[PDB]
Amino acid sequence: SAQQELKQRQRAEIYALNRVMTELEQQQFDEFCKQ
Amino acid sequence: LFHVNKSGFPIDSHTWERMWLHVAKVHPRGGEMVGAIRNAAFLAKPSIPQVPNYRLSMTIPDWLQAIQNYMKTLQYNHTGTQFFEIRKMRPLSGLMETAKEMTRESLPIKCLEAVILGIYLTNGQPSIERFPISFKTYFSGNYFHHVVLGIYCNGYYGSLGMSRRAELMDKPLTFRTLSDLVFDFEDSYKKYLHTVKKVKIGLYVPHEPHSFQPIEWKQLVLNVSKMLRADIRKELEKYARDMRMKILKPASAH
């Protein structure tokens, strides 16, 4: 199914994007618990 | 920001493109970051976690933790784009459909989606009462809105939820009173320098996943930043007492 394939690529892109953005937030949170 | 997916799944070009635009602005590495994901020849496929099932070997706390562990594995959603449209004044029936779809698509969630997933996943332990606890907080010139699923079972209070912060979501079933639970969140917010402005407690959520009743989200509204703590306690215990031993008519009705 095209739609199933697209939904698997979108899911892998979402979780790749998510870990990047969680890492950004945790650095900026940590660096704020500094300053 | 305030981007919510209203196209279902697969996500549509407009929402997808709007997602990548937003994160290109927020992330220091900008387009190198986006381009590197979107042009990947091949992406490792994230494993799909099984939906918890209640087992005879589990205590109630085991079951709540199993549910909470499922949500943590879904991951808190930091993409800017909420993937499941929650229309919280929907009848429980429609929200329970959106919850099963969270289970099927298996993407990251934020706090309101998590509340709805907790209801869905506990709609079958009737000794588990569920009720939304909402917060309005202030921090550094801005207001914030957060919600968790309060639970009450066998004389104790706890909660399920999702949040960036590990101290603003799940709480075990060891709080003897509603006040103790709410004050723990308030003290958890103090750590992050958030002042609580408003606390709103809902009604018990009916256990019928086919109900046409909406969740009542604002049965009790406390302007806590303007109240002394003893009066917060008196109000919360009076209302907790009510919901343990009454059938309160939804405030949103009368």
Residue numbers in the entry:
A (entry chain B): 26 to 60
B (entry chain A): 48 to 301
Which of the paper's sentences describe this entry?
In this cycle, the C-terminal tyrosine is removed by tubulin carboxypeptidase (TCP) and can be religated by tubulin tyrosine ligase (TTL). VASH2 possesses a non-canonical Cys-His-Ser catalytic architecture. SVBP plays a chaperone-like role by extensively interacting with VASH2 and stabilizing the α1- and α2- helices. A positively charged groove around the catalytic pocket on VASH2 is found to target the tubulin tail for detyrosination.
VASH2 alone is poorly soluble; here, we co-expressed full-length VASH21–355 and SVBP1–66 from Mus musculus in Sf9 insect cells. The crystal structure of the VASH21–355/SVBP1–66 heterodimer was determined in the space group C2221 at a resolution of 2.5 Å using iodide-based single-wavelength anomalous diffraction. Poor electron density of some residues of VASH2 (1–48 and 300–355) and some residues of SVBP (1–25 and 61–66) are unable to be generated a well-built model, indicating they are likely to be flexible. To improve the structure resolution, we prepared a complex of N-terminal truncated VASH247–355 and the full-length SVBP1–66 for crystallization, and determined the crystal structure of the VASH247–355/SVBP1–66 heterodimer at 2.2 Å resolution by molecular replacement using the VASH21–355/SVBP1–66 structure as search model. These two structures are almost identical, with a root mean square deviation (RMSD) of 0.28.
